[PDB]
C-alpha cells in the first residue's frame, strides 16, 4: 500500500514558539503513519535517548497513540529529563515515570530562544510543597508563602512561583536554551492506529 497520513512531526519539531517547562505543550499523535527516520532531517540533535525501546526498531512497533511533549530548558537541566531523576525541573516542572517507554530528543536553541538583552519569556517553577506526579502539569500562579505570615501580594517573604531564565547569547553552554521533545508510546486495548512504514 502507498504510504499515506504521515504523522505531523514537523509541527512539533519545526515549531516557531516552544512552551515553557511549567506549561509544556502535549500534542496527541494518532491515526497516522510514523516514519521515525524523518526526525534527523529537522535539526542536528544533541541528545537522543530511548527508554524501554530501541531507536532503530521504532519503525516495526505499532502503537495506539503517541504523545509529544515539548518545552524549553537550560543545558544543565537536560540531565533531569529521565526516569527516576531529581532536580527542580524533574520534580516540580516535568517528571517521567520509572517505567517510561519512549525517547527524549534535545537540541541547543541558542540561535532562536535567546535575545541580546535577555529572553525573559520562558518561566520555570523553582519549588513546590509536593512533588509533581508523572505527566502532571501545574499552571497555577498563586503567590508562594515562604514566611509564616499569610501573603497579600508580591513582597519580601512572598514569591511569584514562576521565575525567568533570561537566556543571553554570551552565556556558556549549560545556561543556553535547549528545546526538548519527549515521545510517549501508549499500548492500550484499542486498535493500534500509529504504525511504522510498511515496505
Amino acid at each position: 500500500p502507498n504510504v499515506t497520513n504521515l504523522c505531523p512531526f514537523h509541527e512539533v519539531f519545526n515549531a516557531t514558539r516552544f512552551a515553557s517547562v511549567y506549561a509544556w505543550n502535549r500534542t496527541r499523535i494518532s491515526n497516522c503513519v510514523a516514519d521515525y527516520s524523518v526526525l534527523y532531517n529537522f535539526a542536528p540533535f544533541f541528545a537522543f535517548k530511548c527508554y524501554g525501546v530501541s531507536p532503530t526498531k521504532l519503525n516495526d512497533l505499532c502503537f495506539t497513540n503517541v504523545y509529544a511533549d515539548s518545552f524549553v530548558i537550560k543545558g544543565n537541566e537536560v540531565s533531569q529529563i529521565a526516569p527516576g531523576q531529581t532536580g527542580n525541573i524533574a520534580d516540580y516542572n516535568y517528571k517521567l515515570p520509572d517505567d517510561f517507554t519512549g525517547c527524549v530528543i534535545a537540541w541547543n536553541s541558542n540561535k532562536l530562544d535567546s535575545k541580546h538583552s535577555g529572553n525573559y519569556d520562558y518561566w520555570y517553577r523553582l519549588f513546590r510543597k509536593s512533588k509533581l506526579k508523572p505527566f502532571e502539569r501545574d499552571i497555577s500562579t498563586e503567590i508562594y508563602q515562604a514566611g509564616n505570615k499569610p501573603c497579600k501580594g508580591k513582597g519580601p517573604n512572598c514569591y511569584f512561583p514562576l521565575q525567568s531564565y533570561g537566556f543571553r547569547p554570551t552565556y556558556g553552554v549549560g545556561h543556553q536554551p535547549y528545546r526538548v521533545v519527549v515521545l510517549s508510546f501508549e499500548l492500550l486495548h484499542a486498535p493500534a492506529t500509529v504504525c511504522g512504514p510498511k515496505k
Epitope: N88, G118, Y120, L126, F127, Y144, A146, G147, N148, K149, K154, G155, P156, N157, C158, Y159, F160, Q163, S164, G166
Partner: single-chain antibody, 247 residues
Amino acid sequence: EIVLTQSPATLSLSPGERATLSCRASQSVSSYLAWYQQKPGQAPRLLIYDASNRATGIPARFSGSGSGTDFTLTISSLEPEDFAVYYCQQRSNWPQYTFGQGTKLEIKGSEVQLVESGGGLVKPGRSLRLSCTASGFTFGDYAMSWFRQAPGKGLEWVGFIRSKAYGGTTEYAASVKGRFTISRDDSKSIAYLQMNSLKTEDTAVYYCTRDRYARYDILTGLSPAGADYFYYAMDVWGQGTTVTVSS
C-alpha cells in the same frame, strides 16, 4: 505615600538608663518594620526586622515591640556605646522603602561585603556612574537596592533592580525617575547607578544594599528568626560613596 514619624527627636540619657523610641505609621505597616543603627561616618546596621526579631549579632538589650500603627524600640541595659541615630523603616510597598526622620541618642543627659566606587565633585549638569562590587555571596540570585543620605538628613531609597529570575526590571523613586538609571552585570558581580542631569539636591552619600533572595526553595525550610534566615534573606549594607555636586 506612607509617612513614618519618630516621636523623640534627640534623646539624652546617661549610660545605664532605659531608652524608648516611638514610630508612628500613617497607615498600617503591620509587622513590616525595621530598625537601623547608624553611627557617624558609618553605614546603617540592622537591629530589628519584622518589628520583633533581633539581628544575629546584636545584644539582647535591643527589644523590638509593636504591631500595627505603633512601634517601640527598647534599650534597657548599661547602654555603653549606643550613641547613634536610629531610623524607622517600613517595607509594606516592597520595592519602595520609606524611612523616618531619625532619633539622636546622646549619651549625656565575613566575606559577604559590598564595596562601592566612584563618587566625587561633579558639576550640576554633568553625569556620574557609581559601581557596587559584591563578594561572598552569589550575585544574580539577589536583588539590589540603592539608598542615599543627604548631609544631616535621613535615609531615602533611590532605586531597585530585580534579579534575573524576576525579569530584572528597575523601579525608581519619584525624585529620580528619568534622571537615574540602574544597571546589572552578573558576570562580574557589579551593580551600576547611572546618574544624569544632576542637581544640587543630589549631594548625598549613596549606598547599595542586598535585597530579597530569589531562591525561595532555601527560605522555606528556614525559620524566620533563625541565624540562617538572616544570613541568606536579610540585608547587607556597604560603605557609601560621597557625591558632591556644586558650582
